[PDB]
């Protein structure tokens, strides 16, 4: 039976909003929390009721409070909670406390936040699958001619990786073996001097890949479909910054061979609810990488690009609804379609003048476009508004559909234009030249698009 | 260009929280106004602002307080106002005031008001743009003659009817020439001068949805079908309509905006017509929106409200931010259907029931959109106003499916503390004379069973 009467939404902003939305809509009432620093926030007010958290706690802490959230949802009848993503979505202890208490988790289940939140675990849950995975070395290996014959197995380029470099330092880039002998022998004893041990382990540099996603559903039944792919090769400092689906350029029978692969290996671990599959891809080839266990920022494109709702269909699968049930209403397979292109980009208080560095203060003037094919998720994006340095100083997140891809980046651009803010900087001036440029208009663009493109850093 | 940063909503209810859901998506803040009575209205708490109007007025009046709303809209420096439906809707001096203050009135100019709310002004600019009306004399007849006569040139049945009287105290029909002799001798006498109009019997009630813009353009959005109504009140509407022709559906719209166009309509509005076999006829214009626009925007994917701010705003019909396609290029996919959960028991001669809802649980899901008024749990349902829980519409590929739907979803909701029309809702979506998709004006009034329990 449905026992999903009130939803809480552990969570913040946007997201919140969002789900806030989805369980209107439903029929159902809603929670949501705040910090003493947000008593000013935009989506304490989009609930049909709010209540401060981790009172004396820490801005980001007090989101993390566990237990004072736990005790907010008994005292105030609450049938299930919403993590959104990125404080406790993926938290293993908050799922199993909300089975404790009796409180619904919308989202997969805690042998699925483990199995997924360790990339060991991952790694292995995908070989036994039978999808490909990037290849490395398990341990370090043992010398010059374990990397040689890893190198004649695999091929360049390849890259040998500090053991306590831990990731994203100690690395070292080989693209040919009149190269490997000294690059070894250097990254050892830079390794030893560095962290104090000379153990380098070697992995397969897959370079330049498109980042390709998959959307996926799976209810307790067993069901499962994808979504389609979403492509997030557009990234700063491999950070997400625009979002296209479907890709534009990627083959239609490579699409094909990536979205199976993300259902079989869900299958595979019988993934309840909604998830999403990464892969690196080059040429014909592609790679597994991570999977989310979780919604995600930019899942508002598929939903465009298919017509499915996710947010609604995550909480009528929580309340044991299958995907091709009545009310959740997803077709087979088969007649799930994709119509034009949606695109996505989060307007902050970036200075892209400054580093980066997120503006705050108080907002003088603020308005925005808006229309058809065009969705406004807005964070705290409002005239009068006080963006504090706490949390992820996003305005709002926009996302644009059109029947073609060229008329779904002419609609961002547009959009990202008809913005008038006045108190507080953005980053629309960098948004304004990646979505402008003969690259990315071109459709056909990888992940080192925007790293290898200076003429974007140019205001 | 675009002026429009803040929207304030005229009304009330599920049609005021329905604005505010377009507003907030399209960027724009919203404010609301209550009465005292809607003190703890859901609505109140749905806009970004909330300001009590009409304070130490009837509840109704509160609603029609036209310089307390225009005053609370210049305080807050709100653009334009959402009159909604069935309130200053159509009221030309809630307009005017609005023009006068600079204020946008998210609606048509005051003469399509004008004409529009007026039965012989509305029939001129009917007839002037070649669209049938129904046949009657252009004054009192001189005699027996001329009743014979009308009718031998529009065919029986004919209805006969008082000047000092007014549509229906003071009305007979005719239905054969035996009858006129003595019927209009009766009518006569009883009256104590009188009219002839053709009687259109059993008619369909087909109403199409127009759309247009500042520069000229116009488009339908093809039709609703609200022939399902019990005592002529609106119980049931689809669409599109299920077994009407589509030569007839494409007559009809081109009626609807043929006639608008040679008015120069604007922004958001309906012709309603009454359908019988082949022909069709003009009846009545509401310059508004209306409850069940959202069937239309289901089977079509466009969104009215919106459309509504925008083209208000100076947009375009086929600008960018409206985005609506060329007349040709807009279609219709699959079915849609509203219905209205009231406190109306039909157990007591359907008497708005009140009270505090103690429990409250309703489905949802695919295809199923809830514009909650004021059903939710500890609610308290006030005397005063509408008396709606929730207005409920479905969507589905097939017709048999929407309806299967709609019944599906009436049967799931559980409502402890007071009475509703769930019982007629169901009898009446279940009945195979409406699942059948053929029927008409005649249908509730002509089926017992849709009354017992």
Aim: hydrophobic fraction near 40%; charge should be negative.
């Amino acid at each position: 039976t449905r026992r999903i009467r009130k939803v809480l939404v552990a969570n913040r902003g946007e997201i919140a909003i969002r789900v806030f939305r989805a369980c209107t809509e439903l029929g159902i009432r809603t929670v949501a929390i705040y910090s003493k620093e947000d008593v000013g926030s935009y989506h304490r007010y989009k609930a049909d009721e709010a209540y401060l958290v981790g009172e004396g706690k820490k801005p980001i802490e007090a989101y993390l409070d566990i237990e004072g959230i736990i005790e907010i949802a008994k005292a105030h009848d609450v049938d299930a909670i919403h993590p959104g993503y990125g404080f406790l979505s993926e938290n293993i202890q908050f799922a199993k406390r909300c089975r404790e208490e009796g409180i619904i988790f919308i989202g997969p289940n805690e042998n699925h936040l483990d199995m997924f939140g360790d990339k060991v675990k991952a790694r292995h849950a995908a070989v036994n699958a039978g999808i490909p995975v990037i290849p490395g070395s398990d341990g370090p290996v043992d010398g010059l001619e374990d990397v040689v014959a890893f190198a004649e197995a695999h091929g360049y380029p390849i890259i040998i990786k500090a053991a306590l470099g831990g990731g994203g330092r100690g690395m070292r880039i080989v693209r040919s073996k009149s190269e490997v002998k000294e690059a070894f022998e250097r990254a050892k004893s830079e390794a030893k001097a560095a962290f104090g041990s000379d153990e380098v382990y070697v992995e397969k540099l897959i370079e330049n890949p498109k980042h390709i996603e998959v959307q996926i559903l799976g209810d307790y039944e067993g069901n499962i479909v994808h979504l389609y792919e979403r492509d997030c090769s557009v990234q700063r400092r491999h950070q997400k910054v625009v979002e296209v689906a479907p890709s534009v350029s990627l083959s239609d029978e490579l699409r094909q061979r990536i979205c199976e692969a993300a259902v079989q290996l869900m299958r595979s671990v019988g993934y309840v609810n909604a998830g999403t599959v990464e892969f690196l891809v080059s040429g014909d080839e592609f790679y597994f990488i991570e999977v989310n266990p979780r919604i995600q920022v930019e899942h508002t494109i598929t939903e465009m690009i298919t017509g499915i709702d996710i947010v609604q269909s995550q909480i009528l699968i929580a309340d044991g609804c299958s995907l091709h049930s009545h009310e959740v209403g997803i077709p087979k397979q088969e007649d799930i379609r994709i119509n034009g292109y949606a695109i996505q980009s989060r307007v902050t208080t970036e200075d892209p003048l400054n580093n980066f560095m997120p503006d705050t203060g108080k907002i003088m003037a603020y308005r925005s476009g808006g229309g058809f094919g065009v969705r406004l998720d807005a964070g705290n994006g409002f005239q009068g508004a006080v963006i504090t340095p706490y949390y992820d100083s996003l305005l709002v997140k926009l996302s644009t559909w059109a029947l073609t891809f060229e008329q779904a980046a002419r609609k961002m651009l547009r959009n990202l234009r008809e913005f008038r803010i006045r108190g507080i900087k953005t980053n629309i001036p960098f948004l304004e030249n990646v979505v402008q440029h003969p690259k990315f208009l071109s459709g056909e663009y990888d992940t080192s698009f925007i790293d290898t493109t200076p003429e974007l850093f140019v205001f």
